[PDB]
Amino acid sequence: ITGAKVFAVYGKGGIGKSTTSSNLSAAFSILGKRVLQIGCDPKHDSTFTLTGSLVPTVIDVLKDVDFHPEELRPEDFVFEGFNGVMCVEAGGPPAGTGCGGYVVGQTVKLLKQHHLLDDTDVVIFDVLGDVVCGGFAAPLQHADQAVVVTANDFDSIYAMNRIIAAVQAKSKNYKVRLAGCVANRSRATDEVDRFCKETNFRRLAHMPDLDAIRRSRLKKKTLFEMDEDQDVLAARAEYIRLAESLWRGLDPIDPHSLPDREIFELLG
Amino acid sequence: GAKVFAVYGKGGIGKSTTSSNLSAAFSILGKRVLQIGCDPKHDSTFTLTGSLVPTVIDVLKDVDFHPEELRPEDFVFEGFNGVMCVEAGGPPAGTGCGGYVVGQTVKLLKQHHLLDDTDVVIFDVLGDVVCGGFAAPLQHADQAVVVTANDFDSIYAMNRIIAAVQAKSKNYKVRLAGCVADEVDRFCKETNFRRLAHMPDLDAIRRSRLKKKTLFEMDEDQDVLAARAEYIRLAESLWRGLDPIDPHSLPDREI
Ligand code: SF4
Ligand SMILES: [Cl-]
């Protein structure tokens, strides 16, 4: 992918990864950029808040024409969401067989087959961070920066440590660098900060999704489409700064992943 | 040629706690247990041996991919009540299929014939993704026990695990033995699944003690002995041979 800044939003599930991913796309669109969010999570609900409905996955449409990306139209797997944010979700691989790199590989293949990347200025990959195998690490081959999503619990810090090693493994042969980590919502961050100081990482922003912003409205609309109040405007500003920082570049860092055993003795 | 079960389910919902106590349950029942932790976070056998045992990929890292001079003392460790257990370890971060790690941890066991004496084998497989790589333990498993909870993510993962066992059963011997953990019961009725039991260790017992040692090794109290009976009743129920069932998977839009 060329001619567009690509960011891979990593992080494990259950912490609101799709929330921080879809709002970053909407924040880029507020700043006047053409955004294109690629949903790579098996749970194809990353672009739900952008479109307002379940977008048909690319693998669902490809499994209808017997794997022939010829009769497919751009309006069959790419849908326009809030503020013109183009939404395409790869979906999950077949249950039991098939690889994740195939679902990610075919999505980018049709995006370049129909020339659906010449107009987009920002590409947002929402990638599952629960595993860091080469199949789900495929969006790192196209991304410029990789912002990881993490929470204060142990499983998120363990996944973040696994993504740091995965991105830096791809960093030796690809342009992808680690831009830092982002707390999922405004809570305690002492355990995340201690991991950053030990790994020479860094935490970026801190969105206030915990205070108010009822989960029913979180997963329904995006923050830039909700009605304005104190908490919405405060959370909107946290995503505008994150989008602007990633746009005009950040000062590079050189983190390192702790061994899988040294992270247990760090937290517990 | 022995009974083998695959503990499947999403992470963070105490799946490793379920697979560990299930292994120790078969041990108390007088069975040779072999728990193979396939989770990338190789903490499946933490409560058994009391320590983070070296993984297969970590041994092959300082062994230069050479399974020549490898002995059972390197990767297989003696756990609680004589439970042999080995962590397969996570795939290399960035590149490397999960099926390769599962494929290289079963050949290292068959190379030494460490299965001609065991009776029950427990597979702790990560259920966050139901891709073909992580679905490799389903090929050998006789049945698969799903770990879930009342949240959406655990039910969504269980719904994809059922579809993963269905497709894998068309060419293998894997079956669906049910699930363990209100809203889950509404899922089983629509999918014709089965809700086995429910271990009551969320309250009174401390997750710190849960992640420390197995329930069969803790100090004998009222709450831990009631939890031992739940895992003992589950171990014998699987050994007796539960009445098989054919659950169907739901579309992702319907789930
Ligand atoms: S590369 Fe990853 S997604 Fe693909 S089969 Fe292997 S473990 Fe599964
Ligand atoms: Cl709308």
Side-chain angles (χ1 to χ4, degrees), chain B residues 1-2 4-31 33-40 42-51 53-57 59-60 62 64-65 67 69 71-106 108-109 111-167 169 171-181 184-185 187-188 190-197 200-202 204-205 208-210 214-220 222-232 234-252 254-255:
Chain B
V4 47
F5 308 96
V7 179
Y8 224 154
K10 205 197 63 176
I13 56 181
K15 174 198 55 178
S16 297
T17 298
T18 303
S19 64
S20 301
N21 296 280
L22 184 61
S23 299
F26 284 105
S27 181
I28 302 301
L29 267 60
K31 308 296 181 179
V33 198
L34 178 61
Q35 177 175 337
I36 305 176
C38 305
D39 200 279
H42 46 268
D43 69 274
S44 177
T45 72
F46 196 13
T47 59
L48 292 175
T49 62
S51 302
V53 296
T55 73
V56 179
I57 50 96
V59 167
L60 299 181
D62 279 73
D64 309 338
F65 291 162
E69 298 180 354
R71 296 189 52 82
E73 297 85 321
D74 298 85
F75 52 101
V76 178
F77 288 82
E78 180 127 4
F80 163 79
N81 201 86
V83 168
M84 317 308 297
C85 49
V86 49
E87 296 285 352
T95 170
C97 177
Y100 172 82
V101 187
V102 182
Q104 291 293 334
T105 190
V106 294
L108 261 293
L109 291 177
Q111 178 182 348
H112 305 72
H113 274 78
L114 303 181
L115 297 86
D116 197 68
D117 60 328
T118 180
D119 302 321
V120 53
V121 174
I122 294 299
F123 266 141
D124 191 3
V125 46
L126 179 59
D128 304 5
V129 183
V130 292
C131 70
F134 288 103
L138 293 181
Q139 299 181 349
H140 323 286
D142 299 354
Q143 299 205 95
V145 179
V146 184
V147 178
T148 180
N150 286 274
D151 59 304
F152 173 84
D153 297 351
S154 302
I155 298 179
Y156 189 92
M158 168 176 46
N159 185 87
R160 295 215 63 187
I161 287 176
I162 294 179
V165 178
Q166 275 188 140
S169 61
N171 285 258
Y172 296 95
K173 58 179 181 179
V174 62
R175 302 297 302 273
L176 285 170
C179 67
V180 292
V184 184
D185 305 74
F187 168 82
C188 296
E190 180 68 24
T191 61
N192 304 328
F193 208 8
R194 196 206 317 267
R195 175 166 165 262
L196 302 175
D201 48 321
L202 175 58
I205 311 176
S208 303
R209 213 151 120 90
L210 280 168
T214 59
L215 293 161
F216 301 90
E217 194 174 46
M218 302 180 191
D219 299 326
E220 301 173 358
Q222 179 188 9
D223 302 75
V224 302
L225 290 176
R228 293 182 190 180
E230 290 292 337
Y231 287 95
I232 288 180
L234 178 62
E236 233 284 76
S237 183
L238 296 174
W239 183 273
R240 282 149 39 194
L242 280 166
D243 299 68
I245 197 172
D246 181 67
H248 73 98
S249 177
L250 294 179
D252 299 327
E254 186 174 353
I255 198 62

Side-chain angles (χ1 to χ4, degrees), chain A residues 27-38:
Chain A
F28 274 128
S29 63
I30 294 300
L31 299 176
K33 311 302 179 182
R34 255 84 59 81
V35 203
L36 171 64
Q37 177 164 329
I38 323 292

